[PDB]
RNA sequence: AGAGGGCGUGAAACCGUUAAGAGGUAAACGGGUGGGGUCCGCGCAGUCCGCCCGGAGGAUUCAACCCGGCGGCGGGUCCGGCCGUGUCGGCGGCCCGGCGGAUCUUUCCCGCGCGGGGGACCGUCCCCCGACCGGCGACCGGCCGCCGCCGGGCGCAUUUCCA
RNA sequence: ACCCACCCGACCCGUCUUGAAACACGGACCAAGGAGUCUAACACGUGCGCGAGUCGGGGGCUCGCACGAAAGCCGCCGUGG
RNA sequence: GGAGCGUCGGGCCCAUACCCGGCCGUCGCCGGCAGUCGAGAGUGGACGGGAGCGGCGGGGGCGGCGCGCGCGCGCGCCCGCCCCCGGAGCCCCGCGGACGCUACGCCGCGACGAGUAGGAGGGCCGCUGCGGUGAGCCUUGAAGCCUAGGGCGCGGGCCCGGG
């Protein structure tokens, strides 16, 4: 099941990382990096995962089929969205809400995408803001 | 697992759980079963009634195999045989009654605890109880002595 | 489906609001009666004496039913018979108090704890001030402040006691249902006596604070409540 | 000294027994050695039963 | 213009000084590190007036602001870049410490990545 | 300062099972929920028993389960046992039963199913009856363990019948001064 | 050589000095403030950001829509077929289904009343199709609805970017 | 958190003791070392497996052991406890 | 002419005691939450005929069980409707459900907290080695050492800066 294998995994997984009074989890398709039942990519029959695009521009959503897990090669199905921020969110929203897929997730999936589109903020602009650089 | 044991948690504390009025000295009672009569008597005669004293007859060269006589109760006599002897019987219509060699299964005596199902038998055994005999007859069977 | 249910839910809503109104009105009239009852009690004690005094006579009024009992010394070095009675009056901490109905049994229990308590016959006002300022229910064994009558009712409403006012009338007149209203009240945690005491260790009669001071328990109440 | 209920029990560790403790760390090495030696003896008694007589 | 945390309440501490160990002052062999005394007579262990204090759970921090740095964050000791990307979805509540043992080349690699993701770093201007 | 004894303020009952096994712990998650959300006290009793020790949930023999359902009226029901169902070789004819158990031994399983019996797991019982309706909640004999024969008024304490811890029974292991009248005295 | 032949690292006790501070109730300590130092964070305004909105400037293509393609989800008609649970029918695998049995038979066979193997029988495990039911995350195929991506269409009261 | 000042508080620890700041003992200072272990037997508690059974030893069959002196299996599965 | 003694007033002084409030922990609550109405709860809902301003014309009770935000109603026009959240717009929503849900988690209410000998629990306290595991760290500097540098933790301790 989901729950059974969460019992096996909850405290032992290689992906987990305690330390410094927090805990985290590094398994893929965990938006929110939580060592939670809810937010765990590997356990659930239906899964969401919002990674950045390898291009450096844009976001990828990562659904999981249901067709056939057992066959991880075919299980996840990726989809780049490289659109005008506000649009990107909405496409993710619909993917999640209007497909009735992992409805629990969804707002977390939006915030992730949002943060990713923040990431691709401008590094040069940040440098200018921190230091006035006036009159030596 | 020392990790789990008590001395890890006693570290720091002086007496190590043995108190500081009285201490952990070596052998304050005497070693072992010392004082069975004097000064440990009460424990002996309120948890071991009858430790001290002889009783009964000596027996010099005891050999246990002479007195070997493992028992079995009617309770579970049919257990000795395959269910399909107890089934091909309550059937058959000859009034046959299947044999149960108890000595084959490793019991010499047949004692008589328990209800025996109304279903004839021939019990071969080295020894029988009185009651075990009676019950067997009441089922409509026959006890059989064997050497 | 939809508009039928909605109206049914609105109907329900209203039937509650009506009932709330009703029970409120009962509470309001119950008080008004108790106002008249205490008035009538007060006057008709004076009435009596004046009438004895008109004749060459005396009106010995009733001995009191009910008394407040404050624990006025601490919890160290206290005899086992005292200590037990003090935890049969629920007077565990120092300066805890309880109402206590009087009778041969009860009075003698106070006699066995005399130099450990100050006590006597509370006023009407005393019963109000104690209940309103420091009225705490025992509600599933959790000391809980009587913020609403929904608390009192929930617990004591099986006796006809449905509000703070009813409670005050049960305590003060020592009704049938006193035991159950009095036990419902968690014992009164009062502060220290402002202006101080006279002497903790000696009896009232002989200058101190302990023992029966009858009328004068009300002064002490005000300086502690 | 005995304390409230238990078998009034006699252990036999009064002689110098730790001088004569016999460990079994051999045993695997032993078990093999027998087994080799066994297979050798077969091979020597060529078509004869390994058993014996 | 540094990274503000989500909520920056008033941390309020019950005790600021270190509890120190009895007679750690008098002797170089005794270390400051707290030890409960277990001595049969002991001014300290029996709570006399005027002595060094004994730590209780009484002094405990408020749970909202326990482990809260002055800045408002909690630390999280990042060890390499991959380990940062965890904090991505916290950033407003946790910051990143970089480890002592991390090299001055890849110390740099972490810092700029945290700057993309807006995770505040607690020892950035350092190795150089 | 207040006078209460803080002596028996902490109740010592279990809360969870002490075991770490994952399947039992799932049953606990299920029956916690049911316990709290249903009115059924069956769920509460069952929940309570899932936290108990091996000792404390003794095996229920098939014959004991038979006779308890043979009782008049509890017919067309389901027997429930938080322990295990074992065989009785000293019973023969096994009626067709309905059973819940955390375990049933392989023999006991065969015998029951051969009869036309149904065996249920505890997750299955919940779906079948979440408020424990139409159940016979049994238990194995708690005081079966040979352990208990040493418990009580000590041996050598008049009118006790309490097995002493003895290395080996036989002519000359106890049965002298303090059991015979001939040797000192007897209790 | 801040590794110099008892030389890797080089703690503490203890000593020398350099700098700072103090000094008649032995010192040292707890609590509480003050003063001074040491560094650390600033600010050469820290007025901190983020949504949405209104106005004002500037800039790319859209979104809304259809059209073509791909991928995904979910659905019932269980429609068609694969899939498997409980039941019933085939006694059909039963010898082309094996093990087990103190069930039987030495009508059998082989080896010497016994051993091995058949042969009955019972228990257990497998084929054939039909019917009912849980139609079960155990899958496919079409159809439907919805979503997303790519490309077509749409050139600008739109949809974006930026200040 | 370094130093200094001041007000209040404040006897030296360890220990045996009814009682220790004691005119009771041990202690100049620092470093490293330094004391409830293991085996056997019992009992109770708890966890797991199987359950009228259970069991593994001892022995054997599988390997030159890289990991193995492991791991696996045994009409020995039960002589036997 | 008390700062003495005996008798008595007011007033004021402060303990870790009492009261109110904060914060930490422990205990208790058949505690709550795996996603729903509902605050002395004292029902909800088919569905069929007969009808309608009818209703259920019961206590100075002072009242809880029955009444004045509607039951039928505004719209389509005496007859019909009284409709669907992929949209009632929401203080309750039974169609789907946390920002919250490491269920060894999270949350709420009360109460309480001296301690030798002794017992038990928890230690994301600490040391050394082993199986796993961190696509860990490390000559672009590991361990150790030192530090009037910055912090965290009630604490065991820990983490960073510089050397
Ligand atoms: Mg001890
Ligand atoms: Mg000692
Ligand atoms: Mg002793
Ligand atoms: Mg006193
Ligand atoms: Mg006195
Ligand atoms: Mg041989
Ligand atoms: Mg002492
Ligand atoms: Mg205590
Ligand atoms: Mg060197
Ligand atoms: Mg050197
Ligand atoms: Mg070297
Ligand atoms: Mg100088
Ligand atoms: Mg002595
Ligand atoms: Mg003496
Ligand atoms: Mg001393
Ligand atoms: Mg002296
Ligand atoms: Mg001496
Ligand atoms: Mg000396
Ligand atoms: Mg050392
Ligand atoms: Mg045991
Ligand atoms: Mg305590
Ligand atoms: Mg102690």
DSSP string, E69-84: -TTS-B--EE-SHHHH
Query: Which of D19, D22, D18 lies closest to D30, judged by CA?
Result: D22
What are phi and psi for residue D34, nearest 5 degrees? -50, -50
Query: Between chains, do D6 and F165 touch, taking CB under 8 Å as contact?
Result: yes
Long-range contacts of B86-92 (CB under 8 A, 24+ apart): B86/B117, B86/B119, B86/F92, B89/B119, B89/B120, B90/B119
Q: Longest C-alpha distance within chain A, in Å?
A: 66
Helices (H), chain E: 81-84, 106-117
| Cα–Cα distance for residue pair E20/E54, rounded to 1 Å | 9
Contact status, residue F19 vs residue F53, Cβ threshold 8 Å: no
- Counting Cβ atoms within 10 Å, is residue B17 exposed (0-12), middle (13-18) or buried (19+)? exposed
Query: Between chains, do F180 and B53 touch, taking CB under 8 Å as contact?
Result: yes
> CB within 8 A of A91, min separation 6: which ones?
A61, A81, A83
Q: In whole angstroms, what separates CA C220 from the centre of its chain?
A: 15
What are phi and psi for residue B73, nearest 5 degrees? -100, 150
Q: Which residue has the tokens 């065996």?
A: F119
Q: Which residue has the tokens 């028992």?
A: B71
Helices (H), chain A: 2-9, 72-75, 86-97, 106-119, 123-130
Q: How far is CA B145 from CA B65, B72, F15, in A?
A: 21, 15, 60
Q: Longest C-alpha distance within chain C, in Å?
A: 84
Residue ranges of E strands in chain C = 66-71, 96-101, 117-120, 136-139, 142-145, 188-189, 211-212
Q: Which two tokens stand for residue E55?
A: 């730590």
| Cα–Cα distance for residue pair C158/D30, rounded to 1 Å | 87
Query: Between chains, do D7 and F167 touch, taking CB under 8 Å as contact?
Result: yes
Contact status, residue F88 vs residue F61, Cβ threshold 8 Å: yes
Q: Taken in order E87, E92, E97, E98, is the CA torsion positive or negative?
A: positive
> CB within 8 A of C102, min separation 6: which ones?
C63, C64, C65, C66, C67
**How many interchain CB pairs under 8 A, D with F?**
10
Q: Which two tokens stand for residue A83?
A: 């659109």
Please name every residue paired with C119 in a beta bridge, in sequence order, or none if there are none: C69, C212
What are phi and psi for residue C191, nearest 5 degrees? -75, -175
Q: Is E39 helix (H, G, I), strand (E, B) or coil?
A: coil
Query: Which of F57, F63, F120, F66 lies closest to F84, judged by CA?
Result: F57
Q: How far is the CA of E34 from the C1' of H24 (A)?
A: 30
> CB within 8 A of A1, min separation 6: which ones?
none
| Cα–Cα distance for residue pair C210/C195, rounded to 1 Å | 17
Neighboring chain C residues of F4 at a CB cutoff of 8 Å: 92
- Counting Cβ atoms within 10 Å, is residue E89 exposed (0-12), middle (13-18) or buried (19+)? buried
Q: Is F135 helix (H, G, I), strand (E, B) or coil?
A: strand
Q: Which nucleotides of G are covered by protein (CB under 7 A)?
A: 12-14, 27-32, 41-44, 46, 48-49, 52, 62-63, 71-74, 101-104, 122, 124, 137-140, 146-150, 159-161, 163
Contact status, residue C68 vs residue C221, Cβ threshold 8 Å: yes
Q: How far is CA F179 from CA B137, D4, E11, in A?
A: 41, 19, 75
DSSP at C85? H
What one-character-per-residue DSSP string does C107-147 give? HHHHHHTGGGEEEE---HHHHHHHHHHH-EEEETTEEEE--
What are phi and psi for residue E65, nearest 5 degrees? -110, 15
Q: How far is CA F168 from CA B33, D9, D16, in A?
A: 17, 11, 27
Q: Is F84 helix (H, G, I), strand (E, B) or coil?
A: strand
Contact status, residue F87 vs residue F61, Cβ threshold 8 Å: yes
By C-alpha distance, the chain F residue nearest A6 is: F22
**How many interchain CB pairs under 8 A, A with F?**
9
Query: Which of C195, C196, C161, C154 lies closest to C176, judged by CA?
Result: C161
Residue count of chain A: 136
For helices F22-37 and A2-9, angle between their N-to-C axes, nearest 10 degrees: 120
| Cα–Cα distance for residue pair F124/F30, rounded to 1 Å | 11
| Cα–Cα distance for residue pair C131/C122, rounded to 1 Å | 12
What are phi and psi for residue C34, nearest 5 degrees? -60, -30
| Cα–Cα distance for residue pair F177/F186, rounded to 1 Å | 8
Q: How far is the CA of E18 from the C1' of G46 (A)?
A: 33
Q: Longest C-alpha distance within chain E, in Å?
A: 61
DSSP at A98? T
Overall resolution, Å: 4.2
Q: Which two tokens stand for residue B27?
A: 């052998």
Contact status, residue F79 vs residue F99, Cβ threshold 8 Å: yes
| Cα–Cα distance for residue pair E112/F83, rounded to 1 Å | 60
Neighboring chain D residues of B30 at a CB cutoff of 8 Å: 1
Q: Which residue has the tokens 């016999």?
A: D22
Which ligand is nearest the CA of D52, by number?
6
Q: Which nucleotides of I are covered by protein (CB under 7 A)?
A: 9, 11-14, 16-20, 22-34, 38-42, 44-46, 62-72, 82-86, 88, 92-94, 96-99, 101-104, 109-126, 133-143, 151-157, 159-162
Q: How many Cβ atoms are within 10 Å of C9's Cβ, its own excluded?
A: 10
Contact status, residue C146 vs residue C152, Cβ threshold 8 Å: yes
F18: number of CA atoms within 13 Å, CB side? 7
DSSP at A57? S
What are phi and psi for residue C73, nearest 5 degrees? -145, 160
Cα angle, residue C48 at apex, residues C42 and C49 outer, rounded to 5°: 100
Q: How far is CA A67 from CA A72, A77, C203, F37, in A?
A: 11, 11, 89, 35
Contact status, residue C174 vs residue C101, Cβ threshold 8 Å: yes
> CB within 8 A of F123, min separation 6: which ones?
F26, F27, F30
| Cα–Cα distance for residue pair D34/D20, rounded to 1 Å | 25
By C-alpha distance, the chain B residue nearest D6 is: B47
Q: In whole angstroms, what separates CA B84 from the centre of its chain?
A: 30
Query: What technique solved it?
Result: cryo-EM
Q: Which two tokens stand for residue E19?
A: 């509890």
- Counting Cβ atoms within 10 Å, is residue E76 exposed (0-12), middle (13-18) or buried (19+)? buried
Q: How far is the CA of D25 from the C1' of H59 (A)?
A: 16
F9 in reach of chain C (CB within 8 A): no
What are phi and psi for residue B124, nearest 5 degrees? -90, 125
B87: number of CA atoms within 13 Å, CB side? 5
Q: Which two tokens stand for residue E45?
A: 């262990």
| Cα–Cα distance for residue pair C97/C187, rounded to 1 Å | 6
> CB within 8 A of C183, min separation 6: which ones?
C138
> CB within 8 A of C68, min separation 6: which ones?
C97, C98, C99, C100, C119, C120, C121, C122, C126, C130, C217, C221
Residue B129, min C-alpha distance to chain D (Å): 35
- Counting Cβ atoms within 10 Å, is residue C203 exposed (0-12), middle (13-18) or buried (19+)? middle
Cα angle, residue F104 at apex, residues F98 and F105 outer, rounded to 5°: 135
Q: Which two tokens stand for residue F27?
A: 């049953």
| Cα–Cα distance for residue pair F81/F49, rounded to 1 Å | 9
Q: How far is the CA of B26 from the C1' of H22 (A)?
A: 33
Helix (H) or strand (E) holding A77: strand A76-81
| Cα–Cα distance for residue pair B55/F173, rounded to 1 Å | 10
Helices (H), B1-145: 6-10, 41-47, 83-87, 102-105, 130-139
Query: Between chains, do D1 and B30 touch, taking CB under 8 Å as contact?
Result: yes
Contact status, residue B123 vs residue B102, Cβ threshold 8 Å: yes
Long-range contacts of A24-31 (CB under 8 A, 24+ apart): A24/E86, A26/E82, A26/E86, A28/A62, A29/A62, A29/A64, A29/A76, A31/A105, A31/A108, A31/A109, A31/A112, A31/E89
């Amino acid at each position: 099941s989901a729950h059974l294998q969460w019992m096996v995994v909850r405290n032992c997984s290689s992906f987990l990382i305690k330390r410094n009074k927090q805990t985290y989890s590094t398994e893929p398709n965990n938006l929110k990096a939580r060592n939670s039942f809810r937010y765990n990519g590997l356990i659930h029959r239906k899964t969401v995962g919002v990674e950045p695009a390898a291009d450096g521009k844009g976001v990828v959503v990562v659904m999981k089929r249901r067709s056939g897990q057992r066959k991880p090669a075919t299980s996840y199905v990726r989809t780049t969205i490289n659109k005008n921020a506000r649009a990107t969110l909405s496409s993710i929203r619909h993917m999640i809400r209007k497909n009735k897929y992992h409805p629990d997730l969804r707002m977390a999936a939006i915030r992730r995408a949002s943060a990713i589109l923040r990431s691709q903020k401008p590094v040069m602009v940040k440098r200018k803001r921190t230091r006035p650089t006036k009159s030596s | 697992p020392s990790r789990l044991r008590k001395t890890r948690k006693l570290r720091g504390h002086v007496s190590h759980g043995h108190g500081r009025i009285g201490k952990h000295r070596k052998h304050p009672g005497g070693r072992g079963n010392a004082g069975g009569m004097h000064h440990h008597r009460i424990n002996f005669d309120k948890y071991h009634p009858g430790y001290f004293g002889k009783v009964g007859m000596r027996h010099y060269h005891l050999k246990r195999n002479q007195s070997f006589c493992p028992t079995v109760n009617l309770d579970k006599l049919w257990t000795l045989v395959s269910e399909q002897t107890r089934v091909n019987a309550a059937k058959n219509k000859t009034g046959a009654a299947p044999i149960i060699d108890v000595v084959r299964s490793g019991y010499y005596k047949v004692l008589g605890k328990g209800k025996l199902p109304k279903q004839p038998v021939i019990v071969k055994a080295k020894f029988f109880s009185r009651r075990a005999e009676e019950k067997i007859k009441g089922v409509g069977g026959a006890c059989v002595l064997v050497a | 489906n939809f508009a039928e249910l909605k109206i049914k839910r609105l109907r329900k809503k209203f039937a509650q609001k009506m009932l709330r109104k009703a029970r409120r009105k009962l509470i309001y009239e119950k008080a008004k009666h108790y106002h008249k009852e205490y008035r009538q009690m007060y006057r008709t004690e004076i009435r009596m004496a004046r009438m004895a005094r008109k004749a060459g006579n005396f009106y010995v009024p009733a001995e009191p039913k009910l008394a407040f009992v404050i624990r006025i010394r601490g919890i160290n070095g206290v005899s086992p018979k005292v200590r037990k009675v003090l935890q049969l009056l629920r007077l565990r901490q120092i300066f805890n108090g309880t109402f206590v109905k009087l009778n041969k049994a009860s009075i003698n229990m106070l006699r066995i704890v005399e130099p450990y308590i100050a006590w006597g016959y509370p006023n009407l006002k005393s019963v109000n001030e104690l209940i309103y300022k420091r009225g705490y229910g025992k509600i599933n064994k959790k000391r809980i402040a009587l913020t609403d009558n929904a608390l009192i009712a929930r617990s004591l409403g099986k006796y006809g006691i449905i509000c703070m006012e009813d409670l005050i009338h049960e305590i003060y007149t020592v009704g049938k249902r006193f035991k159950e209203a009095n036990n419902f009240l968690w014992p009164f945690k009062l502060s220290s006596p402002r202006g101080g005491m006279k002497k903790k260790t000696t009896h009232f009669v002989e200058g101190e604070d302990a023992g029966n001071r009858e009328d004068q328990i009300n002064r002490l109440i005000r300086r502690m409540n | 000294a005995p304390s409230r209920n238990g078998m009034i029990l006699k252990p036999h560790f009064h002689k110098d027994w730790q001088r004569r403790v016999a460990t079994w760390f051999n045993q695997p090495a032993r078990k093999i050695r027998r087994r080799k030696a066994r297979q050798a003896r077969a091979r020597r008694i060529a078509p004869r039963p390994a058993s014996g007589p | 213009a540094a990274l503000r945390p989500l909520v920056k309440p008033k941390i309020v501490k019950k005790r600021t000084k270190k509890f120190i160990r009895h007679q750690s002052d008098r002797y170089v062999k005794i270390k400051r590190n707290w030890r409960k005394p277990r001595g049969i007579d002991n001014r300290v262990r029996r709570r006399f007036k005027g002595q060094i204090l004994m730590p209780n759970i009484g002094y405990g921090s408020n749970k909202k602001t326990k482990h809260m740095l002055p800045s408002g964050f909690r630390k999280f000791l990042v060890h390499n870049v991959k380990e940062l990307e965890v904090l991505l979805m916290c950033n407003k509540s946790y910051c990143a410490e970089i480890a002592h043992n991390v090299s001055s080349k890849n110390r740099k690699a972490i810092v700029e990545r945290a700057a993309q993701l807006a995770i505040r770093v607690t020892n950035p201007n350092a190795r150089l | 300062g207040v006078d209460i004894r803080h002596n028996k303020d902490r109740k010592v009952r279990r809360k969870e099972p002490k075991s770490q096994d994952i399947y039992l712990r799932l049953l606990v998650k299920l029956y916690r929920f049911l316990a709290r959300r249903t009115n059924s006290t069956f769920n509460q009793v069952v929940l309570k028993r899932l936290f108990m020790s091996r000792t404390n949930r003794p095996p229920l023999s098939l014959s004991r389960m038979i006779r308890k359902m043979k009782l008049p009226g509890r017919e067309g029901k389901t027997a429930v046992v938080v322990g295990t169902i074992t065989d009785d070789v000293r019973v023969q004819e096994v009626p067709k039963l309905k059973v819940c158990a955390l375990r049933v031994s392989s023999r006991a399983r065969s015998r029951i199913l051969k009869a036309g019996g149904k065996i249920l797991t505890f997750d299955q019982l919940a779906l079948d009856s979440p408020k424990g309706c139409g159940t016979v909640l049994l238990s194995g004999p708690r005081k079966g363990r040979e352990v208990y024969r040493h418990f009580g008024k000590a041996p050598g304490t008049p009118h006790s019948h309490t097995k002493p811890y003895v290395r080996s029974k036989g002519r000359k292991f106890e049965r002298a001064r303090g059991r015979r009248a001939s040797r000192g005295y007897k209790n």
